[PDB]
């Protein structure tokens, strides 16, 4: 890599690892469209297995970017419209509070207070129906954003219904395979388990547990190489030969709602570039990011703005991830770690690196 990249990465990430006690980490810096890879530490401490460019990390909520793009691809195929009522795809949702809740609302956390998590007690399809049938909104649709796995999770599950494919099969066929993300998995196959890092929480090696709508909201695992290619694909959608996927990427970066200086996409979130770094750093703290906030509709949604900071955080019990990119500058970063450490520390390090390289 260019010396300036090596220098800023060492001076930013090695101290972050020191400060946060991260056992293993992989970083990709995309500079002038090209990824440069860096790794530190161990994927499995007790086995002394190093992190490599083939190590799989849990992406946590970064998974939502795949879900958003898959939904955008379904829009571009004409299979769904964001204005469609939820009940078109799940007519058994007969409870009256669902009148007026659209796929847009589900995708963008604006349905009116769907909860952060689907309850752990939901183990079956009938359990899931009962959960949504009994949920009572705190707000009218399209007025407040409350980040929620139960919201975008349902969006993803319904968005694939016209295809006749399972969520996993749709994701593999329509997103992972065309983009050659051949080491990205909703379910890690047995032959790939050897590359699956352990997450570390309070000294214990952990992997994320199964849960309802996990694949859609927080369940993807990937390598630093595949995540760099994901960033490249989102930086340069016109390089994608499959038109529906090119357009799905663009639709996931359209601006559907605004709160403060942040715009909600499909999975992705965006701010105008140049960004105020304190707003992205501070806004990533879970006390802020997970609070309910009023939104202003953008109608029609703003088509993807090249001069944007586009990003997403994610975590599981044992992992912490962050992706950010700036299309106009062909500049991006992926940070994958096998400890869950605070979001503001991730975002601050990412901005120090990208700011140094602009
Ligand atoms: C995504 O990783 N999230 C959603 C939310 N934080 O948003 S973000 O990561 O800061 O962007 C809460 C934490 C995290 C998440 O929900 N991960 N999955 C889990 O926490 C649980 C594991 C087991 C029980 N249900 C989900
Ligand atoms: Cl130094
Ligand atoms: Zn040093």
Question: Is 150 tagged catalytic?
Answer: no
Q: How far, in Å, CA of 85 to CA of 97, rounded?
A: 12
Q: How far, in Å, CA of 341 to CA of 79, rounded?
A: 39
Q: How far, in Å, CA of 86 to CA of 236, rounded?
A: 32
Question: In terms of Cα–Cα distance, which of 262, 251, 266, 268 is closest to 294?
Answer: 262
List beta partners, residue 85.
102
195 is in an annotated binding site: no
On whether the CB atoms of residues 338 and 198 are closer than 8 A, the answer is yes
- Residue position matching structure tokens 């469609």: 84
Cβ–ligand 1 distance for 65 under 6 Å, the answer no
In which domain, by residue range, is 190 found? 1-358
How many other CB atoms are there within 10 angstroms of residue 99's CB atom? 12
How many other CB atoms are there within 10 angstroms of residue 172's CB atom? 16
Is the alpha carbon torsion for 305, 310, 249, 328 positive or negative? positive
Cβ–ligand 1 distance for 287 under 6 Å, the answer no
Q: How far, in Å, CA of 266 to CA of 65, rounded?
A: 7
Q: How far, in Å, CA of 102 to CA of 86, rounded?
A: 5
Question: In terms of Cα–Cα distance, which of 40, 16, 59, 23 is closest to 345?
Answer: 16
Find the 202 Cα to ligand 1 centroid distance in Å.
17
Say whether the peptide bond before residue 330 is cis (omega within 30 degrees of 0). no
What's the CA angle centered on 88, arms 98 and 71, to 5 degrees? 100
On whether the CB atoms of residues 324 and 332 are closer than 8 A, the answer is yes
Residue of 206, 213, 218, 323 best suited for mutating to test ligand 1, as the one with most atoms within 8 Å of CB = 218
Is the alpha carbon torsion for 76, 80, 84, 86 positive or negative? negative
For 26, the token pair is 């992989």
Q: Exposed e or buried b for every residue in 208-233, given b needs 16+ CB within 10 A?
A: beebbbbbbbbbbbbbbbbbbbbbbb
109 is in an annotated binding site: no
| Count of positions (residues) in the chain | 358
Q: Which of 61, 163, 222, 233 is the catalytic position? A: 61
21 CB burial (10 A radius; 0-12, 13-18, 19+): exposed
In three-state form (DSSP H/G/I as H, E/B as E, the rest C), the secondary structure along the chain is CCHHHHHHHHHHHHHHHHHHCCCEEEEEEEECCEEEEEEEEEEECCCCEECCCCCEEECHHHHHHHHHHHHHHHHHCCCCCCCCEHHHHCCCCCCHHHCCCEHHHHHHCCCCCCCCCCCCCCCCHHHHHHHHHHCCCCCCCCCEECCCHHHHHHHHHHHCHHHCCCHHHHHHHHHHCCCCCCCEECCCCHHHHHHECCEEECCEEECCCCCCCHHHHCCCEECHHHHHHHHHHHHCHHHCCCHHHHHHHHHHCCEEEEECCEEECCCCEEEECCCCHHHHHHHCCHHHHCCCEECEEEEEEECCCCCEEEEEEEEECCEEEEEEEEHHHCEEEEEEECECCCHHHHHHHHHHHHHHHC
- Residue position matching structure tokens 């020191």: 18
Task: Give the distance, in angstroms, between the CA of residue 51 and the centroid of all CA atoms in the same chain.
Answer: 22
On whether the CB atoms of residues 159 and 301 are closer than 8 A, the answer is no
Question: In terms of Cα–Cα distance, which of 206, 101, 120 is closest to 158?
Answer: 101
222 is in an annotated binding site: no
Cβ–ligand 1 distance for 230 under 6 Å, the answer no
Deposited resolution, Å: 1.3
Find the 33 Cα to ligand 3 centroid distance in Å.
26
| Domains identified in the chain, total number | 1
On whether the CB atoms of residues 46 and 130 are closer than 8 A, the answer is no
Cβ–ligand 1 distance for 201 under 6 Å, the answer no
Q: Which residues contact 230 (CB under 8 A, 6 or more apart)?
A: 65, 66, 179, 181, 184, 222, 323, 334
Q: How far, in Å, CA of 31 to CA of 329, rounded?
A: 8
Find the 9 Cα to ligand 3 centroid distance in Å.
10
How many other CB atoms are there within 10 angstroms of residue 125's CB atom? 10
List beta partners, residue 339.
200
Cβ–ligand 1 distance for 3 under 6 Å, the answer no
Q: How far, in Å, CA of 311 to CA of 333, rounded?
A: 9
Point out the ligand 1 atom lying closest to the alpha carbon of residue 209: 23
Q: How far, in Å, CA of 58 to CA of 199, rounded?
A: 8
Crossing angle of helices 63-76 and 224-235, rounded to 10°: 40
199 CB burial (10 A radius; 0-12, 13-18, 19+): buried
């Amino acid at each position: 890599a260019p010396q300036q990249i090596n220098d800023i990465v060492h001076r930013t990430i090695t101290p972050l690892i020191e400060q946060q006690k991260i056992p293993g980490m992989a970083v990709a810096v995309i500079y002038q469209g090209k990824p440069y890879y860096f790794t530190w530490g161990y994927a499995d401490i007790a086995k002394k297995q190093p992190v490599t460019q083939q190590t799989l990390f849990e992406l946590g909520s970064v998974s939502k970017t795949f879900t958003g793009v898959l939904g955008g691809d379904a829009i571009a195929r004409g299979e769904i419209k964001l204005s469609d009522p939820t009940t078109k795809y799940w007519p058994e949702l007969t409870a009256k509070q669902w009148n007026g809740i659209t796929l847009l609302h589900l995708a963008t956390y604006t349905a009116g207070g769907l909860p952060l998590q689907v309850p752990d007690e939901v183990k079956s399809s009938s359990d899931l129906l009962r959960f949504y049938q009994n949920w009572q909104p705190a707000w009218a649709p399209g007025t407040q954003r409350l980040y929620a796995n139960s919201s975008i999770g349902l969006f993803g599950a319904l968005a694939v219904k016209p295809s006749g494919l399972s969520f996993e099969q749709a994701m593999q066929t329509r997103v992972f395979q065309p983009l050659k993300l051949n080491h990205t998995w909703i379910n890690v196959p047995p032959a790939e388990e050897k590359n699956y890092a352990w997450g570390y929480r309070e000294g214990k090696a952990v992997h994320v547990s199964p849960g309802a709508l996990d694949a859609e909201a927080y369940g993807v695992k990937s390598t630093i190489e595949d995540m760099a290619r994901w960033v490249q694909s989102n930086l340069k959608p016109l390089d994608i030969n499959e038109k529906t996927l090119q357009q799905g990427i663009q639709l996931a970066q359209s601006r559907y709602w605004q709160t403060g200086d942040m715009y909600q996409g499909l999975g992705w979130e965006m701010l105008d570039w140049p960004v105020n770094p304190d707003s992205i750093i501070n806004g990533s703290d879970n006390k802020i990011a997970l609070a309910a906030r009023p939104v202003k509709a953008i109608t029609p949604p703003t088509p993807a703005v090249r001069a944007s900071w586009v990003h997403k955080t994610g975590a599981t019990g044992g992992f912490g991830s962050y992706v950010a990119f700036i299309p106009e500058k062909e500049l991006g970063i992926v940070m994958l770690a096998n400890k869950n450490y605070p979001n503001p520390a991730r975002v601050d390090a990412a901005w120090q690196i990208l700011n140094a390289l602009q």
